[PDB]
Write a protein that binds this DNA or RNA. Sequence first.
DNA 1: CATCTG
DNA 2: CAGATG
Length: 327
Amino acid sequence: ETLNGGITDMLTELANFEKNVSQAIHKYNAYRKAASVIAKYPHKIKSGAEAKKLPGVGTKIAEKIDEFLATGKLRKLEKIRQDDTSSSINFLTRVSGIGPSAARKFVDEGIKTLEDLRKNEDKLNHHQRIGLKYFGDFEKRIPREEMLQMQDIVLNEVKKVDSEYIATVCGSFRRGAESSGDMDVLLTHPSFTSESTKQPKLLHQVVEQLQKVHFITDTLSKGETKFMGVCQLPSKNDEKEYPHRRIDIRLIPKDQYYCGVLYFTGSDIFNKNMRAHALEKGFTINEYTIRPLGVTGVAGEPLPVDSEKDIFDYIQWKYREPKDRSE
DNA sequence: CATCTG
DNA sequence: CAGATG
Ligand SMILES: [Mn+2]
Ligand SMILES: [Mn+2]
Ligand code: NA
Ligand code: NA
């Protein structure tokens, strides 16, 4: 957690680069189990050899560790932090819609910067366009104070369309967090479930409304269950408009809301522990359901949940306020 | 994993 | 349809 820090870090820089610049998924994947195992490792790695001793630890990495250990740096790492081509990809990649794949093409075409991008707005697709248009707003975090307003709106509109809608703002916003990154909304309705054959309108009607009133400003992606968009709190008394915010909304069959709801709320760590325990208590949990574990090895059957209460209950656990879902 | 692009 | 982004 701090004993093998640098090493686990450099390994990361390294892994990262492989996958993003080169395509070295293998290699990339290599750095990772490695930093993963060095990470767990209880002592102070005093040398390569010592390391090598580990699983996932090859000669090549051992090598690298030596050099890093020996000297506060790694040549290779130094060559990559300079290299403008590598740099570009880590950059372009910052645009919503631009993955690495695309980061490469553009570079090979000479688009390396934001301007480059604007000038060639033709090569970018819709999402990519949007991402470009909101690059700034995009990277700005979401203050709770805004979150609450947002939430307030969303909830009032969903309600209006159907008193029967059930909406939840999961995410950290749900876990306490003073600021968030995007707004994740879980959606269900009684009339939608496991078996119930669809009802796309269920998601579309609200999406409309949100745009009706102008909260939703653009569409990133719009499926029958998931909507990726952009929204925005009405600029008040003109002088201070709000940044544009990433927003996602997803429909869920009523019969698997809370699992999801729990699930989305995290934290990852809270989950696992919950999952691990769930397992003890003779259960299995996932994004959609909790299931009574048979002994034969495994086994299932959807346990019935009517809240997050029902869940914990199952695992015979302490109902955790979302704040304490931390870890 | 669900949506888009081409 | 494979492949890419989130
Ligand atoms: Mn979030
Ligand atoms: Mn999200
Ligand atoms: Na991106
Ligand atoms: Na293939």
